Design a protein that fits this description.
The structure is cut from a larger assembly and holds three copies of chain A.
Chain A (H helix, E strand, L loop, with lengths): L12 E3 H11 L4 E4 L6 H9 L3 E4 L3 H15 L4 E4 L3 H16 L3 E7 L15 H5 L5 E4 L6 H13 L5 E7 H4 L2 E3 L19 H13 L3 E5 L1 H5 L3 H11 L3 E3 L19 H7 L2 E5 L20 E6 L13 E4 L2 H15 L8 H22 L7 H9 L7 E5 L2 H9 L8 E2 L10 H11 L5 E6 H7 L3 H6 L5 E6 L27 H5 L3 E5 L2 H13 L4 E6 L16
Parallel strand pairs in A: 2-3, 2-4, 4-5, 5-7, 6-7, 9-10, 9-11, 11-12, 12-13, 14-15, 14-16, 16-17, 17-19, 18-19
Antiparallel strand pairs in A: 1-8
Bound molecules: ligand UQ3 (3 copies), ligand 8FL (3 copies), adenosine-5'-diphosphate (3 copies), chloride ion (2 copies) and magnesium ion (3 copies).
Organism (chains A, C): Alphaproteobacteria bacterium
Keywords (chains A, C): Lyase, Metal-binding, Nucleotide-binding
EC number (chains A, C): 4.1.1.8
């Protein structure tokens, strides 16, 4: 009818939803995760018309988590789309997690019409006010002709400097409001984030300090992965022959099988190093604040970070390298060519690191070899690690499940491990997996979660099936939070869940493949069948209720 | 060993977790929904030792929704317990919903140790700052000896006046910090919320206005359900013979089968009334702001609300009745004893209401009787409504599923319907159902959700199974958000999985699962699900294009 | 007497007030402006014991403005000390002004005792929450032993990166609480803010663009004055021969009498430039957003700013130079030597600039020479400018008084003009003057305020007299806000004040010298006497009610 090409069409006007979609596409947004509804249905449809991939989720929580993981994987702010009111409130989880991890993110939240403000409109809410404490940038788009301006400013703010979350509030009457095409002020395309360099004397001072250290340690954080500095870091470590330690999501910047990794002697390396070189890593709880009882009280610090305000937190920095990871390590490699220095091939430090790695390997070897059922964590990961392709993207989530999987699942390329992060968040699991499968559909995506962690976002398995994402979900079920629990007229323990739950049947609700494992003899065949199945799958593994990690001198939290 | 009763034990000291547990119990907290972890594990354990019922959920979203539902059902603030950092941020969902619905709740969020503030500690976060815009009350507990003070003040703030959410921040070193039991200052027990009355002239002016109206309408909102005013409201309606309209969760304050209800002629009643008596209901979007095009421009308003600031919002109130719903309607009943007036037995207003009711009944009658498969919404509810016990607690969630279920599922007692509420929230479904099953285990609990709504909180079925809650989950699956979609070109943003076998989720956790696609299967499946001694899911594949009855006005406008 | 040295004393403990004083002194805080009272009296007393200069003001509003001006003048965060409750709320003015100008400052606010929280204590308030939106950093000090930690972190957060305000909340029980001196954990001394450099290809790209421009313009902002980049900028301008425009408080980075200044042809220079080089200046309202109708639609931008997120705001930047102004201009000077280029001595661009300067000079020449009484603004500034020493510190505040004074009072060294700034704030006048008199007591401090501006902070004249600060306050009184008003059965107009007010008698209330000027013949002798008076002085000049600035093609705001 009105879709006949023979009829006269106005064709001069454009509405806010369309301008938003074009601006997002211009600014490099390729993925949009969310849940539609009033008033954002036109936004999702217009985004699809511009070629943006829209992924409809089952909860805004996972959608806001998927958005920032896709941002991390692409190096580019990607979008989360939620409805007014509780849509935005649900998505506050992702804003908080993206702020704490320094990951970019664009949350687009619908709002009730401006003309109804004050009246008690449907899902009326002070949305910019609620989001502001968790965002680098948060603003309401008051008029549709200003959409290109706001999308450019929001993307730029989220991407430049220390990355973080941006929020755009889209009222209903702005989404549907129309303006003349020829009257809309265009906006420039946001390019690559600016890279800054360190002063030359800071470069030379860092090398001076490295040459003088008896027990140096390089710590590779996920700031280097975000900076895409892996080439420069690998050259720097190879030329200096310096021992290095990867952070949880810094794994892969250096290959985990590199002979200079101290990952198997982590506590001794932190305890005994006289100099620590922080590469895109913070002295927060992940690295135990750089302070006793985990470090020498007199540890010297070279700190490379883009955030000037981060320099010297908790432990003073002897040499500060403020700027971009890739750029500054490039400076170090250039300055190394004039020094002709490397850490000597034989030092007591190297011998102590090697002895500790072998001691820790012998401590967990019987647990890895133990075929008895119900299985311990290390036995389970023996079969899992042996079936992980070298280009896989690993999502890990839980307490023991995640921590033990971190040391038992090596990464050989950067940006290939996504876990609970600097916020210790449960609920990122399947959202991260959906984002990884959307961004890199040619690579296998394996999520290894505990039974508690799986419950936070397990409904998103339907999302993966609906979009043909062959995500492999492996659940390590001990029947509780961190540990199992003997079944109780006493009430159930607060940490207890269901040890006999058949989570794999959730995969069969949505056309995926489900596998249940209780004996070690079943694990191999089940994992083989799950990996070969052309589609998403769940392997539910009932592990020992009392299985625990390797004993250590220090508690992880302390 | 150290627990041998022969061993000398020092018993003088108590820590913050135990103080928190004793204070919550003293203040009437019987239910605590949450997810444990650093640092709140001692709090949940201590709560159970005091006899508090701890319910471990699967997401803090549902835990915060369950807490406010339990508060609405019990009449006292109930607790939601979450870990530091993302635990609180996940729980902000429930604070906002409780704020908007004027429902109390107490959120107890753990926090990182005070002595590590600034260091980038595990899950360090400005938690009070984040929660403050969503709460009536939000404060950190800085020392464990002040826990009785803060619990009393938080519960009192949540419960008294216009109810709302309260937040208490519990740092790790306060939870584990010890004090001498004899040195802790006790706190008074928070009693019932104060009830206030209206001036006598306002009472008389309200009754004078009722006598003068040609087309009066009483609107009964959930503020009367919160106020426990059902006895007084029923006496008021039976005395005055006035037509009434229930709001969505005001259903049941008056029985939905009462002959004075105008529910089946709702649009006509709002449009043509010359006087509206608001009982604990707002002129917000749920009542279309009391303005055109849904009301007469000159509609006269009697407004009963506890909140003085709410009086006259959008539409001016000719008579204001600021105070408690139960006390004020009691005043009206007492003042009516001196008047011979009642709304007459036969008026053109009654005839117009009755005719419009019959017209809407005949408009939906063919759909209710249509046994065509895949079924429409009204046909599905024909079998559901015939099997709902009259004392059931009904949870409704979705768009078409919820709105059509609102008209097809009558409630005969108050506080027995829990739905998306004033915030239009998807995600409250199984959290509300778990709350209802915990508070009223002797009553049946039936949640009717759309397929989209179920996806928000479906994992909480494991919670119901783990606690032996025989919740009956009925899913109306059209394969999308509000309506279905043809199979795919990428999938439509609103599309879900029409062929999904959601009922197998019940079988993951020991419940009964039922799949219905034909009308002949619906009856036997509902029979078996209601009779099964445990939780159950009935997954009904409905027509992808089934819709609600056509109306003159869109619900939103 | 308990003060006799013969008596045994404890000496082993220290309270929070003393730890705060020692930490502030260690971190380079030399000046503390505030008003004492519960609970901060011990803090100011302890600060004086460590040698910190305490300045007791008459309103926290001016104290908070003084602290940030002293921070700008010293290059390090200086302190404002206020009481609980309304003391902090009064001081929010300074936090907002410091945020908008990117100036550092440390606000120290007392709080009611922690043990009384919730009870309705005296001046109990959510002080961190109120201050947080206006601060880079805001935190409460919960225990006295962590004071060194928080002071270090607050000073560093205010000073590093883009500077801004930091707030520390000091409860009464923390101020008076005692700890063992040997158990207090020390904190490192905050050094100079880190400097970052631009990548070399960006440096060369900037020089390439400069060589290609037909009508280039360098804009020198107060970011270069903060960065102490004046010598690098002066070398760059001398070697490139580029015309330059100074921003309001950028005046002095280049001397105002420099022949390359386009200040006398500002509108034409911005309108016609084909390339603009922003040096530590933003495209905000002060530079008219870098957009039409004040700029060419195709103007090319080289942008030097420390804040990566600011790059490309309103007008896209062709070359981004993210880093420190001093460091990056140093790179440009070094890279300039590799080439053989300067902007030619004879171009149509230079002729157009010189013609507009001469035209604008001839437009105001009659007003400057007009001895008519009541005097116009330009006539008043003829006598003021002739008596301003070349090393003076000038404070300007008002509308016409400030804007006309900006062009009539040249500065020849940087950081010597303090005015309403990027926030357009009235109320900074005597607070800025007191700060300048405290930081540079060996230099003359002259504040030229309109009559409305003086009323905001005029009581601080007592502060100047109490501390022996010979501040010279010159008031231009037209009897209203922006303009005069005829005498009023009619109420006074909202902008009207008192044209016949004798503000100079305020000086005689506090021991200063007051001078009243109505005729041009009195102006010179009055200024001579005020400048020679060995103390603070007020010269109250009753100017014409309808005196105005020279007409322009565009309104300053637009
Ligand atoms: S609940 C709340 C949820 N919680 C979270 O969200 C926090 C997540 N938690 C973390 O982020 C980490 O927990 C930290 C904080 C970074 C600490 O780190 P971490 O102490 O856990 O260290 P990591 O996990 O790397 O290794 C553990 C031990 O295994 C040794 N090890 C490593 N690799 C091998 C190998 N291949 N073979 C044999 N042994 C190995 C290693 O050497 C060390 O033993 P050690 O050296 O201490 O004796
Ligand atoms: C789609 C997706 O992207 C979304 O973003 S959605 C967002 C989620 N959405 C919500 O959160 C909205 C919740 N929505 C509401 O809260 C209600 O919608 C209101 C706002 C209160 C309006 O109310 P309401 O207009 O819907 O009225 P009600 O539901 O009571 O009844 C309907 C018609 O059935 C007639 N009727 C009643 N009873 C019987 C009977 N027994 N037999 C025959 N007919 C009957 C009655 O008379 C009327 O017909 P009428 O009188 O107008 O001709
Ligand atoms: C409503 C009222 O109550 C208020 O609420 S107020 C609020 C308080 N308000 C503020 O907070 C804003 C302060 N305002 C500014 O920040 C400036 O306003 C800008 C925004 C930077 C624009 O700048 P500007 O347009 O004012 O230009 P500038 O002041 O530099 O010079 C003026 C004209 O004099 C020419 N000129 C310069 N030097 C000489 C000389 N030596 N001889 C002869 N002529 C000269 C120059 O060329 C130009 O003339 P043009 O080129 O346009 O023809
Ligand atoms: C529940 C929970 C965990 C599960 C461990 O149990 P799971 O079965 O997943 O793994 P297990 O250790 O192999 O048994 S960790 C944790 O910190 N936490 C608290 C926690 C709760 N909520 C949020 C949002 N973030 C959290 N961080
Ligand atoms: C998804 C969604 C709905 C489901 C309708 O689809 P469902 O299958 O549940 O029911 P149907 O109508 O029978 O098909 S309603 C709605 O407002 N909304 C948007 C919505 C999204 N997120 C949140 C927190 N609140 C919302 N309100
Ligand atoms: C009153 C006022 C001004 C005085 C001009 O009158 P004044 O006698 O000082 O100078 P005149 O122009 O020579 O007469 S400017 C201005 O923006 N403003 C509004 C103004 C008010 N309050 C604050 C905090 N900031 C402001 N910016
Ligand atoms: N391009 C970049 N170059 C260098 N550092 C960066 C860059 N982007 C972000 N960073 C910094 O990297 C740090 C990441 O630290 P963190 O998340 O604690 O690492 P990890 O958790 O791996 O130890 C942040 O402090 C952030 O400021
Ligand atoms: N005890 C009480 N007595 C009277 N009114 C109350 C009481 N408690 C709450 N209210 C009011 O009841 C109203 C509920 O309105 P609303 O949630 O819009 O109801 P509905 O959704 O049923 O229309 C709120 O405005 C609240 O102030
Ligand atoms: N050390 C520094 N080097 C370079 N730029 C800086 C430095 N410190 C601050 N800046 C920048 O200087 C800019 C000041 O701009 P603005 O206050 O608008 O100047 P003006 O008002 O003089 O135009 C801010 O954007 C700030 O980020
Ligand atoms: Cl019961
Ligand atoms: Cl000096
Ligand atoms: Mg577990
Ligand atoms: Mg549906
Ligand atoms: Mg004036």
């Amino acid at each position: 009818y009105f879709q006949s090409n023979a009829m006269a069409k106005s064709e001069g006007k454009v509405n806010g939803a369309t301008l938003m979609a074009r601006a997002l596409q211009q600014q490099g947004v390729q993925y949009m995760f969310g849940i539609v509804g009033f008033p954002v249905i036109p936004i999702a449809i217009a985004a699809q018309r511009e070629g943006i991939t829209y992924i409809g989720m089952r909860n805004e929580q996972s959608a806001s988590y998927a958005a920032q993981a896709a941002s991390y994987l692409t190096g580019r702010p990607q979008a989360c789309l939620v409805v007014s009111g509780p849509g935005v409130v649900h998505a506050l989880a992702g804003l908080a997690n993206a702020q704490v991890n320094c990951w970019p993110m664009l949350l687009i939240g619908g709002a009730s019409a401006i003309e109804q403000n004050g009246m008690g409109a449907f899902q009326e809410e002070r949305q910019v006010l609620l989001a502001s404490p968790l965002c680098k940038y948060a603003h309401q788009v008051e008029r549709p002709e200003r959409i290109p301006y706001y999308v450019e400013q929001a993307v730029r703010s989220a991407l430049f400097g220390r990355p973080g979350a941006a929020y755009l509030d889209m009222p209903d009457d702005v989404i549907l409001g129309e303006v003349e095409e020829a009257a809309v002020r265009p906006a420039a395309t946001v390019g690559e984030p600016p890279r800054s360099l360190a002063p030359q004397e800071n470069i030379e001072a860092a090398l001076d300090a490295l040459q003088s250290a008896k027990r140096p340690l390089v710590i590779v954080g996920k700031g280097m992965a975000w900076s895409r500095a892996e080439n420069e870091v690998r050259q720097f470590i190879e030329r200096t022959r310096l021992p290095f330690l990867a952070t949880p999501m810094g794994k892969g910047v250096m290959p985990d099988d590199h002979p200079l990794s101290v990952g198997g002697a982590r506590s001794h390396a932190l305890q005994e190093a006289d100099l620590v070189f922080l590469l895109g890593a913070r002295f927060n709880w992940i690295l135990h604040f750089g302070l006793p009882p985990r470090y020498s009280k007199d540890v010297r610090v070279i700190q490379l970070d883009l955030s000037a305000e981060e320099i010297g937190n908790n432990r003073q920095a002897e040499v500060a390298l403020v700027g971009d990871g890739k750029a500054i390590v490039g400076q170090l490699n250039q300055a190394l060519s004039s020094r002709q220095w490397f850490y000597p091939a034989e030092t007591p430090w190297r011998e102590a690191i090697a002895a500790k790695i072998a001691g820790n390997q012998a401590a967990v070897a019987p647990m890895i070899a133990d075929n008895t059922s119900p299985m311990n964590y290390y036995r389970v990961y023996r079969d899992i690690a042996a079936r992980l392709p070298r280009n896989a993207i690993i999502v890990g989530e839980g307490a023991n499940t995640m921590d033990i999987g971190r040391t038992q699942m090596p990464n050989f390329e950067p940006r290939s491990r996504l876990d609970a992060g600097s916020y210790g968040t449960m609920g990122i699991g399947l959202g991260f997996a959906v984002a990884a499968a959307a961004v890199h559909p040619g690579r296998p995506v394996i999520a290894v979660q505990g039974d508690s962690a799986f419950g936070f976002s397990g409904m998103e398995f339907e999302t993966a099936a609906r979009y043909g994402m062959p995500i492999k979900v492996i659940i390590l079920n001990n029947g509780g939070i961190g540990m199992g629990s003997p079944a109780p007229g006493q009430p159930g323990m607060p940490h207890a869940l269901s040890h006999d739950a058949r989570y794999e049947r959730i995969a069969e609700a949505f056309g995926g493949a489900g596998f249940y494992v209780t004996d070690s003899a079943e694990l191999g065949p089940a994992l083989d069948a799950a990996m070969a199945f052309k589609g998403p799958a769940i392997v539910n593994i009932k592990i020992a209720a009392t299985a625990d990690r390797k004993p250590q001198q220090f508690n992880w939290h302390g």
